[PDB]
Amino acid sequence: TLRLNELAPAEGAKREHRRLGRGIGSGVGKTGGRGIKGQKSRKSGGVRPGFEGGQTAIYRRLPKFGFTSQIALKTAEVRLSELSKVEGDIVSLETLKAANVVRRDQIRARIVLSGEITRAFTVQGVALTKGAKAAIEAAGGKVE
Amino acid sequence: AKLKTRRGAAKRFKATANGFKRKQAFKRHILTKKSAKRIRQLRGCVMVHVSDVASVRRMCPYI
Amino acid sequence: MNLKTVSGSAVELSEVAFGREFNEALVHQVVTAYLAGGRQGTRAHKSRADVSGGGKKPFRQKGTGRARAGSIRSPIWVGGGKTFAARPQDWSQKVNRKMYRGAMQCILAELVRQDRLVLVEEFAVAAPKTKELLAKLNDLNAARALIVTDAVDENLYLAARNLPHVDVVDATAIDPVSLIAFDKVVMSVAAAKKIEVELG
Amino acid sequence: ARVKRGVVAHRRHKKILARAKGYYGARSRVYRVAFQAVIKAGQYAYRDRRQKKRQFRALWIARINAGARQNGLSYSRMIDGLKKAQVIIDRRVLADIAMHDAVAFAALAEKAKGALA
RNA sequence: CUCAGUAGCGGCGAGCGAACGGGGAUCAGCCCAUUAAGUUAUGUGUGUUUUAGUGGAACGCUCUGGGAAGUGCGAACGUAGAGGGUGAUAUUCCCGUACACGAAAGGGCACACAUAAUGAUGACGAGUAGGGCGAGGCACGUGAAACCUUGUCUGAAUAUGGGGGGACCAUCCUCCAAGGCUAAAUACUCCUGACUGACCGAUAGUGAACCAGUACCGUGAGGGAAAGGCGAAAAGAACCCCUGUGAGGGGAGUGAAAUAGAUCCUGAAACCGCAUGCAUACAAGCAGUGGGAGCACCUUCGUGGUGUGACUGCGUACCUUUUGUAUAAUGGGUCAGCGACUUAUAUUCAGUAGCGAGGUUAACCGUAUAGGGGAGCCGUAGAGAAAUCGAGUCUUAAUAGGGCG
RNA sequence: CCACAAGUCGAGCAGGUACGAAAGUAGGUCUUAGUGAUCCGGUGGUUCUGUAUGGAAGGGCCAUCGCUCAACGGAUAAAAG
Numbered sequence A: 001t002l003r004l005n006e007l008a009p010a011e012g013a014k015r016e017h018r019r020l021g022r023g024i025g026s027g028v029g030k031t032g033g034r035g036i037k038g039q040k041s042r043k044s045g046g047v048r049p050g051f052e053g054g055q056t057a058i059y060r061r062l063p064k065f066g067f068t069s070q071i072a073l074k075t076a077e078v079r080l081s082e083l084s085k086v087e088g089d090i091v092s093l094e095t096l097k098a099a100n101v102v103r104r105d106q107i108r109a110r111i112v113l114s115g116e117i118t119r120a121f122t123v124q125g126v127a128l129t130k131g132a133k134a135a136i137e138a139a140g141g142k143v144e
Numbered sequence B: 001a002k003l004k005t006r007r008g009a010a011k012r013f014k015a016t017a018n019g020f021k022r023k024q025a026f027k028r029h030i031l032t033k034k035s036a037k038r039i040r041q042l043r044g045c046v047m048v049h050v051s052d053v054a055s056v057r058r059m060c061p062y063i
Numbered sequence C: 001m002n003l004k005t006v007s008g009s010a011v012e013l014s015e016v017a018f019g020r021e022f023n024e025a026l027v028h029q030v031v032t033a034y035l036a037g038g039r040q041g042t043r044a045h046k047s048r049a050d051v052s053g054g055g056k057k058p059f060r061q062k063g064t065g066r067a068r069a070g071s072i073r074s075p076i077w078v079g080g081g082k083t084f085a086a087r088p089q090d091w092s093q094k095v096n097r098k099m100y101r102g103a104m105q106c107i108l109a110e111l112v113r114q115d116r117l118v119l120v121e122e123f124a125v126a127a128p129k130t131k132e133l134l135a136k137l138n139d140l141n142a143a144r145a146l147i148v149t150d151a152v153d154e155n156l157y158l159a160a161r162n163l164p165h166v167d168v169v170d171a172t173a174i175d176p177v178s179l180i181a182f183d184k185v186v187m188s189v190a191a192a193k194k195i196e197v198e199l200g
Numbered sequence D: 001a002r003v004k005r006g007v008v009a010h011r012r013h014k015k016i017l018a019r020a021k022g023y024y025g026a027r028s029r030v031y032r033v034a035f036q037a038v039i040k041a042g043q044y045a046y047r048d049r050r051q052k053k054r055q056f057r058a059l060w061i062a063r064i065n066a067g068a069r070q071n072g073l074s075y076s077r078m079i080d081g082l083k084k085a086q087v088i089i090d091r092r093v094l095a096d097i098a099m100h101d102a103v104a105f106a107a108l109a110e111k112a113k114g115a116l117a
Numbered sequence E: 001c002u003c004a005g006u007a008g009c010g011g012c013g014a015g016c017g018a019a020c021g022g023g024g025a026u027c028a029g030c031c032c033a034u035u036a037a038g039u040u041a042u043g044u045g046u047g048u049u050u051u052a053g054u055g056g057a058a059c060g061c062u063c064u065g066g067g068a069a070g071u072g073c074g075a076a077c078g079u080a081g082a083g084g085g086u087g088a089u090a091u092u093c094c095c096g097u098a099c100a101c102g103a104a105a106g107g108g109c110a111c112a113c114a115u116a117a118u119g120a121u122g123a124c125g126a127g128u129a130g131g132g133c134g135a136g137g138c139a140c141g142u143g144a145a146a147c148c149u150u151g152u153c154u155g156a157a158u159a160u161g162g163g164g165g166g167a168c169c170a171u172c173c174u175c176c177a178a179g180g181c182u183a184a185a186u187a188c189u190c191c192u193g194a195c196u197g198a199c200c201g202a203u204a205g206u207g208a209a210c211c212a213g214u215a216c217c218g219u220g221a222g223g224g225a226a227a228g229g230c231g232a233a234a235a236g237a238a239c240c241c242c243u244g245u246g247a248g249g250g251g252a253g254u255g256a257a258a259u260a261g262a263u264c265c266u267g268a269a270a271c272c273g274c275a276u277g278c279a280u281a282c283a284a285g286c287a288g289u290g291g292g293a294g295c296a297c298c299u300u301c302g303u304g305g306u307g308u309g310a311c312u313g314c315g316u317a318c319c320u321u322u323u324g325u326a327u328a329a330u331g332g333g334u335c336a337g338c339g340a341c342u343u344a345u346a347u348u349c350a351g352u353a354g355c356g357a358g359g360u361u362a363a364c365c366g367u368a369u370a371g372g373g374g375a376g377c378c379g380u381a382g383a384g385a386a387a388u389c390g391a392g393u394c395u396u397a398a399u400a401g402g403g404c405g
Numbered sequence F: 001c002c003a004c005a006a007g008u009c010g011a012g013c014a015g016g017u018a019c020g021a022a023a024g025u026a027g028g029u030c031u032u033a034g035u036g037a038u039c040c041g042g043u044g045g046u047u048c049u050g051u052a053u054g055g056a057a058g059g060g061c062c063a064u065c066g067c068u069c070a071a072c073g074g075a076u077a078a079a080a081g
């Protein structure tokens, strides 16, 4: 035990890799699992993803819809349970960013009722849902 | 390198909690001859079929 | 944990650093990762594009009776390119910080269990002479050993340089391969406490 | 880690050629020909391990027929008589007795006739 | 490094693909006519390095052997147990290694001072900004197309002035074009020195280990090989014999070994001889297989071993491609050597290990697999095109119904 | 009913309505053919978006228009020997 020639990996951790075209006995000899002839048996034989043989594809017989919002990329969602990562009792955008629950380029945040908290927090300038606000006050905290 | 999204499919599909949603065809034009029931039932989103979900996943690896 | 030195004195060390159960799979992963990271990986071969010459078609496609050929440097031909030419590779693997620390703790605990770790209150030599260190190790009955100190004294380093199966390291420089390879590990109390603070 | 194939390939070819000993011409000298000859020999042996039982039973039946006809019976009548007499001696032993001990086979034929009566 | 294959561009196809912000490396500004930082030459001084070199520890006996470094026994050195050689495998036989010294003379670099030059024909920027036409560049294909460049035609205001903030206007914010110089972090290897390799070992590795870009081919540009090994030491065989004073061999001699004798270590296969044993000149075919007499040698004397195989049942090769091949369908004259599912990145699933409502760092720093580095990423919430709400949300006049949860 | 994309029948609820004294009937025509995806644009609305801010341009959503794309799941806007 504890020698360079008495160390082994756990059972099932390692496997031999598959080696094609090395005889009848291996079970993957000759064609190597590619079948007989056709396009897929050639080198680089697959067709492009989304190609269906020539008929109009699924992503082209359906219409485009919607537009992309720019402020949604800067809006951040915060679970209520994540408030425990904040050091101190003040919950603001700056302290959430310091605790790393909000990305540094976000300009506003929202707190949703997802988990549970015990400490009392003071919330400054962060939007709260109805249930999140109720939980914040029930934990002995307040908003501004 | 990084897998690249097929932007045409990205413009057609969006992800739901357990799948993908999409709009319905045959509502762009030639609408006068269509019955009211077809007009109001082809409106809105539906789900992508399970037979097409795999292709959608290969085409849109990040959504 | 309470362990006695050679001179019978009692030292108290944390169970976290020196008392964790042995996890052979984790230790094996970390040891093999260290050995893989020791590789240099410098080599290359020439493919059919790198081999000298071979630009032109050796003979016409039809009519000669030969098998068709496109270049004299084809990998089928003698003297042609290697089919899958190699390039220099990096053999380093990522090891999780916690996994590395856990493997080191397991190794230290197993050494303590197997009695290959020897604690000493003080380990120093008065001169950079090989024979003095050899006599000290012989009376400690640790002729083949890795010595771990809080700081490596120059005289100790010079005395240990020429001894086979003997090495000397700082407390912050131990590695899982060297902890296992040597027959015994002679560790001073100061080095043991520094290792305890590092927590394996 | 370049691997040279010479030693192992030579061993395999030499083993095939050693199993091909005694064959005519290229079948005992040339590897491509010798390898086909060894496989076909194995196939023939597999088939003939079944054919041997049939051939030897046919030989036993022929010898028993000769003995029965010397004793005044046919093979089918003798077999039927022995079955009716409850004798369960098999054809291999019956043919051995027919070939090497005429008196015992005469006694067996008499028992078969007595049971047929 | 990330943001992010996101925002966008695109016969809205195939594909192309940012920026803002954040984390790092490195950090530096100085001037436009009495003219700056800086840079380059030359000369002097100091420091450092480089081009020859010197010394450099410690082993004996015994056995096998042609030969000892190997066996057995017992010693010595180690700031030297890197490496190479020596008749087989050496810390102590040799060259070296650690370490300690060393330069008439010449070269490189750094710093300081001194003298030139240069920066510097340039003094706040007019045929300029802007505009019409045609093109090019921007991730951006004329698009709602801002911004940069200009071939052509034009053309301001000039600090109460002018440029930008993606058509455009107003308001705010921000900067000062039409004059310049500037180290580091970055890119590379024809070369020089030292060190290294889960790189090759003569069909490999450079085309080339060898008198190789040679022989050879072509008018020419150009193309382009094959070919390493006697022995520790030539001790490379004096002399005799056959033969043509040839080649070649038999003796002798050397050597541990000459079937190590010169294209000489080992000496495989295809292919070609000689010798011995058995079979074979009345019998029709993938050549074997299951039986089976006789003969020869060996012998543990047989219910044994080796070689051969009269006679006999059955029996149309292999691969590929095909509905289907003995097929008169394809491929192979034979042997030996080489010859085809890889590597990098991203992603998904399974197994396994750590940690666990959390998990994990990237670049980078780091006498460097450690330890630091939390930017970022994934998970923890969904609905809606979106604004918005949120265990709900969308649709709707509807709290009805219904869809996603 | 169906590979997908599509196609077909539908009781019942709410609002407004027509014809009936009323119970009621009516979401085109006895039924099964009379048809064309996506892209790109046009038009009418809209409590959505709007690249510093207020607007606007442009985009989104709802309704609707333009193919003998008839080789009728339609490879180009654009092609004979």
Ligand SMILES: NCCC[C@H](N)CC(=O)NCCC[C@H](N)CC(=O)NCCC[C@H](N)CC(=O)N[C@@H]1[C@H](O)[C@@H](OC(N)=O)[C@@H](CO)O[C@H]1NC1=N[C@@H]2C(=O)NC[C@@H](O)[C@H]2N1
Pocket: E234, E237, E251, E262
């Ligand atoms: N019982 C029967 C008795 C019969 C009776 N006797 C009569 C009979 O019948 N007799 C037969 C005679 C046999 C045969 N005909 C004789 C024969 O052939 N002589 C040949 C004589 C000339 C020969 N060609 C010369 C030759 O080649 N030199 C080589 C050559 O330059 C070179 O090699 C390569 N690579 O090219 C080099 C490699 O470096 O080595 C050289 N050489 C070296 N040697 C040295 C060494 O050892 N150390 C140091 C260094 O000096 C080494 N270099």
